[PDB]
Amino acid sequence: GSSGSSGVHVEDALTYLDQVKIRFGSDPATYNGFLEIMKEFKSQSIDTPGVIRRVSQLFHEHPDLIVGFNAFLPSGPSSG
């Protein structure tokens, strides 16, 4: 058929988080860098478009993840 799971409940943040760990299981070095990248944002150091710059480079070998996140993100042009 086709691999795909539609319908994401509100609380859909950690979801993408874990995925990063699973994909980069044998490669902990990659995951680590990601953890730090977040901190920056959690410290009011970078902005939405700022965290993406770091991620991109990190998941450079994974274009599917870099793009997936963008959309995945809850925030957007949607009401609110």
UniProtKB/Swiss-Prot annotation:
Compartmental location: Nucleus
Chain positions covered by the region annotation Interaction with REST: 28-74
PTM: Ubiquitinated by RNF220 that leads to proteasomal degradation.
Boundaries of every PAH domain copy: 8-74
Superkingdom, natural source: Eukaryota
Subunit structure: Component of the SIN3B complex, which includes SIN3B, HDAC2 or HDAC1, PHF12 and MORF4L1. Interacts with FOXK1/MNF, MXI, MAD, NCOR1 and SAP30. Interaction with SUDS3 enhances the interaction with HDAC1 to form a complex. Interacts with CRY1, HCFC1, MAD3, MAD4, MAEL, REST, RNF220 and SETDB1. Interacts with C6orf89. Interacts with MYT1L.
Its biological purpose: Acts as a transcriptional repressor. Interacts with MXI1 to repress MYC responsive genes and antagonize MYC oncogenic activities. Interacts with MAD-MAX heterodimers by binding to MAD. The heterodimer then represses transcription by tethering SIN3B to DNA. Also forms a complex with FOXK1 which represses transcription. With FOXK1, regulates cell cycle progression probably by repressing cell cycle inhibitor genes expression.
Stated name of the protein: Paired amphipathic helix protein Sin3b
First-to-last residue of the parent protein present: 32 to 98 of 1098
